[PDB]
Amino acid sequence: AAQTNAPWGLARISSTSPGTSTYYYDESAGQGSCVYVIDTGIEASHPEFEGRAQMVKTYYYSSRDGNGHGTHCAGTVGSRTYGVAKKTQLFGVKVLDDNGSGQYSTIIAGMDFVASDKNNRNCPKGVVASLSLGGGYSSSVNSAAARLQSSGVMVAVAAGNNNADARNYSPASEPSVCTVGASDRYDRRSSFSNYGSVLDIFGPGTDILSTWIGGSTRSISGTSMATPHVAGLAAYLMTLGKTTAASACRYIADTANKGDLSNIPFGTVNLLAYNNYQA
Ligand SMILES: [Pr+3]
Ligand SMILES: [Pr+3]
């Protein structure tokens, strides 16, 4: 299948070179997989989700996304127009308040929740969790991410936006998950993207158009935007049977565009998420 005039990030993950405008993908499009978006919530009623999005848990007074951030990330995972895996099932877990913040204890509870909740869902092709959040280093937060991964969920987390070594941030610094840096449409490391040896992969993160609350759209930037590209890519690959939750990050790294990025510090991987689609 082919989506013409796609957002640049979708086109980039189906090309060996920057500058293309078509997103090439297999028609299966992540059908039968599930992605938990652990964030500010999801505006599930947005037309772009086509009824495939559902709030399953909130840690605040409402399950509504009063912020937009979670809806944006969810859109990059699996919205019709802006999503990588256009037929995946989306589950929202609201661990961040409408200001975009949350206590570590709540974020940990949300991860433990997903590990259990997935056992009550029909996700025959597998389960992904997308975490576009983080803060200063915490061994408890890292441990929670490692548990979630161990439970059989592909965990993708943002590297952080501090232009620093991600070793000092959580859950970015947990080695066993998939830590995602950001790039721009000219294949440069995004100027805000964290780096370091703990990064596994880069994805498009600068000027990413996706869904927003109030049934709208907007373009924003961050490693928050790169992470759902990789989460959606994992769902897509799991549906195709190419990989499993345990090995998806490694498979994505193995099959990535290599050496294409500029402004990558020595010691950081030069790997850009790529779906390897061949008609
Ligand atoms: Pr290339
Ligand atoms: Pr890793």
Side-chain angles (χ1 to χ4, degrees):
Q3 177 192 0
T4 58
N5 297 151
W8 81 262
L10 302 187
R12 188 65 193 87
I13 75 182
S14 65
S15 183
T16 58
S17 61
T20 68
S21 56
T22 302
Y23 176 38
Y24 297 100
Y25 63 100
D26 187 273
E27 284 76 4
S28 55
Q31 190 175 5
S33 68
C34 301
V35 183
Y36 287 79
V37 182
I38 304 169
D39 209 289
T40 62
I42 304 176
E43 185 173 279
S45 66
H46 201 302
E48 279 285 328
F49 292 127
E50 305 175 300
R52 292 176 290 101
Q54 185 176 160
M55 289 300 295
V56 307
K57 178 72 170 171
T58 180
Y59 287 95
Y60 302 87
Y61 314 93
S62 175
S63 57
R64 280 185 62 263
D65 181 4
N67 184 287
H69 185 266
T71 296
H72 198 270
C73 293
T76 295
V77 174
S79 76
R80 176 177 47 108
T81 299
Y82 315 101
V84 173
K86 298 169 182 301
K87 297 176 179 170
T88 194
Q89 186 96 343
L90 296 158
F91 299 126
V93 181
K94 181 174 186 42
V95 297
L96 304 178
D97 65 16
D98 290 339
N99 288 318
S101 55
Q103 292 303 295
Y104 268 170
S105 61
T106 301
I107 290 159
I108 284 164
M111 288 191 257
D112 289 329
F113 169 81
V114 169
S116 169
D117 185 73
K118 66 152 147 60
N119 298 319
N120 315 323
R121 310 280 167 196
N122 249 323
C123 306
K125 298 297 186 180
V127 182
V128 181
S130 190
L131 285 101
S132 293
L133 55 80
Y137 178 89
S138 166
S139 59
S140 294
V141 169
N142 278 7
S143 176
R147 290 198 299 278
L148 181 54
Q149 176 72 47
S150 167
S151 82
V153 176
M154 193 278 184
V155 180
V157 308
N161 306 322
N162 319 90
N163 187 30
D165 197 317
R167 74 198 303 177
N168 290 326
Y169 300 93
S170 290
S173 58
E174 169 51 41
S176 70
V177 303
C178 208
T179 304
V180 184
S183 64
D184 69 20
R185 76 171 71 222
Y186 300 103
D187 277 0
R188 303 174 294 216
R189 175 175 65 91
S190 290
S191 61
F192 52 79
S193 182
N194 281 352
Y195 47 87
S197 59
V198 72
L199 265 71
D200 296 288
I201 191 75
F202 283 81
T206 297
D207 292 339
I208 304 299
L209 176 63
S210 188
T211 50
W212 199 255
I213 59 182
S216 55
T217 58
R218 72 175 59 181
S219 179
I220 55 172
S221 300
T223 48
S224 276
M225 284 64 254
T227 306
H229 282 90
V230 166
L233 180 57
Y236 168 88
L237 288 168
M238 285 157 67
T239 288
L240 283 178
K242 300 271 201 177
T243 190
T244 68
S247 53
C249 190
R250 172 179 291 202
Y251 181 85
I252 281 166
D254 276 351
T255 59
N257 280 310
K258 330 206 174 52
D260 275 355
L261 301 173
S262 70
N263 197 24
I264 302 293
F266 195 80
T268 297
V269 293
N270 198 322
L271 297 169
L272 179 62
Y274 175 53
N275 72 359
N276 268 281
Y277 178 75
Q278 273 164 143

